[PDB]
Design an enzyme around this catalytic site. Structure first.
Site, PDB file in Angstrom:
ATOM      1  N   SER A 102       0.799  -1.217   0.000  1.00  0.00           N
ATOM      2  CA  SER A 102       0.000   0.000   0.000  1.00  0.00           C
ATOM      3  C   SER A 102       0.839   1.279   0.000  1.00  0.00           C
ATOM      4  O   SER A 102       0.471   2.246  -0.660  1.00  0.00           O
ATOM      5  CB  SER A 102      -0.956   0.029   1.185  1.00  0.00           C
ATOM      6  OG  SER A 102      -1.806   1.158   1.078  1.00  0.00           O
ATOM      7  N   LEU A 104       3.539   1.773  -1.487  1.00  0.00           N
ATOM      8  CA  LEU A 104       4.099   1.975  -2.801  1.00  0.00           C
ATOM      9  C   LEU A 104       3.017   2.418  -3.789  1.00  0.00           C
ATOM     10  O   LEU A 104       3.277   3.265  -4.646  1.00  0.00           O
ATOM     11  CB  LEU A 104       4.837   0.715  -3.268  1.00  0.00           C
ATOM     12  CG  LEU A 104       6.040   0.394  -2.377  1.00  0.00           C
ATOM     13  CD1 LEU A 104       6.773  -0.829  -2.848  1.00  0.00           C
ATOM     14  CD2 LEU A 104       6.984   1.585  -2.283  1.00  0.00           C
ATOM     15  N   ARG A 106       0.521   4.211  -2.969  1.00  0.00           N
ATOM     16  CA  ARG A 106       0.215   5.602  -2.598  1.00  0.00           C
ATOM     17  C   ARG A 106       1.143   6.615  -3.267  1.00  0.00           C
ATOM     18  O   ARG A 106       0.887   7.824  -3.247  1.00  0.00           O
ATOM     19  CB  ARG A 106       0.224   5.765  -1.075  1.00  0.00           C
ATOM     20  CG  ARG A 106      -0.926   5.004  -0.399  1.00  0.00           C
ATOM     21  CD  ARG A 106      -0.799   4.977   1.131  1.00  0.00           C
ATOM     22  NE  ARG A 106      -1.578   3.861   1.676  1.00  0.00           N
ATOM     23  CZ  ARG A 106      -2.588   4.007   2.520  1.00  0.00           C
ATOM     24  NH1 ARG A 106      -2.930   5.220   2.930  1.00  0.00           N
ATOM     25  NH2 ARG A 106      -3.239   2.941   2.967  1.00  0.00           N
ATOM     26  N   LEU A 128       8.483  -9.588 -11.276  1.00  0.00           N
ATOM     27  CA  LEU A 128       7.522  -8.544 -10.897  1.00  0.00           C
ATOM     28  C   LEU A 128       7.155  -7.618 -12.050  1.00  0.00           C
ATOM     29  O   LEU A 128       8.028  -7.050 -12.718  1.00  0.00           O
ATOM     30  CB  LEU A 128       8.086  -7.690  -9.757  1.00  0.00           C
ATOM     31  CG  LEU A 128       8.736  -8.425  -8.592  1.00  0.00           C
ATOM     32  CD1 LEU A 128       9.678  -7.503  -7.809  1.00  0.00           C
ATOM     33  CD2 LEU A 128       7.660  -8.999  -7.696  1.00  0.00           C
ATOM     34  N   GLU A 129       5.854  -7.446 -12.262  1.00  0.00           N
ATOM     35  CA  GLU A 129       5.363  -6.565 -13.282  1.00  0.00           C
ATOM     36  C   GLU A 129       5.094  -5.222 -12.639  1.00  0.00           C
ATOM     37  O   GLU A 129       4.149  -5.095 -11.860  1.00  0.00           O
ATOM     38  CB  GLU A 129       4.092  -7.148 -13.882  1.00  0.00           C
ATOM     39  CG  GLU A 129       4.263  -8.574 -14.380  1.00  0.00           C
ATOM     40  CD  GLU A 129       2.943  -9.345 -14.415  1.00  0.00           C
ATOM     41  OE1 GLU A 129       1.893  -8.761 -14.049  1.00  0.00           O
ATOM     42  OE2 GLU A 129       2.959 -10.528 -14.824  1.00  0.00           O
ATOM     43  N   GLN A 148       4.594  -8.165  -1.080  1.00  0.00           N
ATOM     44  CA  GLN A 148       4.465  -9.133   0.005  1.00  0.00           C
ATOM     45  C   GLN A 148       3.939 -10.461  -0.490  1.00  0.00           C
ATOM     46  O   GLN A 148       3.081 -10.512  -1.366  1.00  0.00           O
ATOM     47  CB  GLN A 148       3.536  -8.615   1.090  1.00  0.00           C
ATOM     48  CG  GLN A 148       2.199  -8.116   0.576  1.00  0.00           C
ATOM     49  CD  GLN A 148       1.549  -7.208   1.584  1.00  0.00           C
ATOM     50  OE1 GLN A 148       1.343  -7.605   2.726  1.00  0.00           O
ATOM     51  NE2 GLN A 148       1.240  -5.969   1.182  1.00  0.00           N
ATOM     52  N   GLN A 174      13.878 -20.117 -12.336  1.00  0.00           N
ATOM     53  CA  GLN A 174      14.367 -18.865 -12.927  1.00  0.00           C
ATOM     54  C   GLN A 174      15.130 -18.056 -11.892  1.00  0.00           C
ATOM     55  O   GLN A 174      14.690 -17.923 -10.745  1.00  0.00           O
ATOM     56  CB  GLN A 174      13.230 -18.039 -13.543  1.00  0.00           C
ATOM     57  CG  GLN A 174      12.257 -17.500 -12.532  1.00  0.00           C
ATOM     58  CD  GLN A 174      11.158 -16.654 -13.145  1.00  0.00           C
ATOM     59  OE1 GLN A 174      11.169 -16.346 -14.346  1.00  0.00           O
ATOM     60  NE2 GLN A 174      10.196 -16.281 -12.320  1.00  0.00           N
TER      61      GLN A 174
END
Ligand SMILES: Cc1cn([C@H]2C[C@H](O)[C@@H](COP(=O)(O)OP(=O)(O)OP(=O)(O)O)O2)c(=O)[nH]c1=O
Ligand SMILES: Cc1cn([C@H]2C[C@H](O)[C@@H](COP(=O)(O)OP(=O)(O)OP(=O)(O)O)O2)c(=O)[nH]c1=O
Ligand SMILES: Cc1cn([C@H]2C[C@H](O)[C@@H](COP(=O)(O)OP(=O)(O)OP(=O)(O)O)O2)c(=O)[nH]c1=O
Ligand SMILES: [Mg+2]
Ligand SMILES: [Mg+2]
Ligand SMILES: [Mg+2]
Lengths: 189, 189, 189
Positions: A102, A104, A106, A128-129, A148, A174
């Site tokens: 949250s 991030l 914000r 991570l996208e 998380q 990977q």
């Protein structure tokens, strides 16, 4: 059925769930905070005319690693692939979700995790996208908390877990943000 | 294990789950519809050169409240923070998800909820990450249904729930869309 | 509590969960891969001044079907509605999630599923919210795998499942990407 902090800790101490490196100070009420690696893929190709999920296009992205001690700058309206610093190893009876944080969001930093779940049996870093939907560039620091991991109990152990030939898995093991392998076993009508 | 309408109602009538105000007509097969507050944060800063999650930047957004009876206009390609009209109080043994609604996504209004889960022990309004991906501005009306709350049972009660010093929580009790506090306890390598 | 491959298969063979057509080769450790239909809605209206969720605006999108054997081209920074090839029928005691696939996000194709859950009792095709966040157009092929369905057990059967008058459901039985019906029963303060 989502694992509480205590049960996450039990799965880790029992060796059923691998997280390498594991930092216990990152465990949260219902999840464990995860960290950003130093490996990024940017969409900066200048030769292809388009993306075709049925075709192999390994040059679609460039792998970028910032100078030690420096951030990667994610520009407004930009999407890149990042990776978790941690290597995760799941047993055949849990599935994870790799959500954002949250704090991030914000700031306009969105982790999409469009696919939602980390599969039973999965072992590797998580890709991570990441999007910036603010009006300003965002300095992403390798090592920062980026999201998380939440764990769910499966109803029963998975019969052919991720990594098995029968699942036809593409990304087992990977170590970085692997380019897409959607062209493999790709089907269309 | 996701709570059905009946079990959501039981958690509410038993006083284990607080939702203030609670409107029973909003309960759904598997979730409860939630409503939009009159408080919005826009990314309209003109002094900062960039966003740095390691730094405090409280002026990144402006708090905006539309005139009573008027909508807030979310422009195409714009992201803002909104807030739930409801105040939620969770027990130590449930975790929620604050999702969007299909009717709203069919118009190009996306609630991101990048972080996914509302933590066991959380009490406050929920901060909504809202994007418009249509070609047209969207009038957001304070009070409209904006998303839905789904509850999951935890495997066991959380040991150090949200709000506890040990969890290091940043937003316990928030009454509006609190600016990001990612700079607190921020780590990097 | 998320259904493993085996339990998904049991719900299907028992007839509790309908998926039409069902292809068993699509079942995965913890989900079943789903396929894209040939029906798309584009935001290409040139008369309306804005979107108002309180108003009926059926002309906001155009229904587009590519020529047989051709892809639909999703342009960079564009969002459209798509649909699953499969028709899903859920019992009153499971809820689904229709997530994207990691292979597709690695190319900048994002399935949003902003609303998260497919409701207990839901029967129909599922409407997909699709964005392209790459720098290049993406050829979407009707029939390709576009996402995955994950099933969660409900705590108990839903009392008034999707489709019931009491739930006030808008999309029961939909065969395509139905335009938004948010104007129905719309509330505001
Ligand atoms: C997902 C979400 C959570 N929240 C609330 C409920 C969560 O329990 C709380 C924290 O979410 P987190 O994702 O855990 O936020 P954080 O880790 O960046 O900050 P913290 O140190 O406080 O944990 O914020 C929102 O306000 N909006 C949201 O969209
Ligand atoms: C999440 C999602 C659901 N659906 C389907 C399955 C859901 O059970 C159904 C309703 O989703 P909801 O998110 O509940 O939509 P809504 O509240 O705006 O409309 P309603 O009054 O009908 O509840 O729509 C999609 O078609 N696409 C999606 O991405
Ligand atoms: C959701 C997600 C998963 N993963 C990992 C964990 C998943 O178990 C694994 C596969 O995710 P999937 O969504 O199943 O990817 P896929 O179906 O396109 O490819 P595959 O044939 O291998 O199944 O990828 C990421 O790296 N990043 C992510 O955001
Ligand atoms: Mg947190
Ligand atoms: Mg609904
Ligand atoms: Mg897969």
């Amino acid at each position: 059925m989502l694992l509480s902090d205590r049960d996450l800790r039990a799965e880790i101490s029992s060796g059923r769930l691998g997280i390498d490196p594991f930092d216990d100070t990152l465990v949260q009420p219902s999840s464990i905070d995860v960290r950003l690696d130093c490996l990024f893929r940017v969409f900066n190709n200048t030769r292809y005319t388009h993306i075709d999920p049925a075709k192999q296009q390994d040059e679609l992205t460039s792998l970028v690693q910032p100078v030690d001690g420096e951030p990667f700058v994610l520009h407004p309206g930009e999407f890149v692939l990042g990776s978790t610093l941690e290597l995760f190893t799941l047993p055949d009876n849990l599935a994870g979700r790799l959500e954002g944080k949250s704090s991030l969001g914000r700031l306009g930093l969105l982790t999409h995790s469009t696919a939602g779940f980390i599969d039973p049996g999965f072992s590797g870093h998580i890709t991570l996208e990441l999007s910036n939907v603010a009006n300003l560039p965002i300095t992403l620091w390798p090592g920062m908390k980026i999201g998380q991991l939440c764990m769910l109990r499966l109803t029963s152990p998975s019969e052919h877990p991720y990594g098995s030939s029968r699942a036809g898995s593409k990304y087992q093991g990977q170590r970085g943000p692997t380019p897409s392998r959607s062209y493999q076993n790709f089907i269309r009508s």
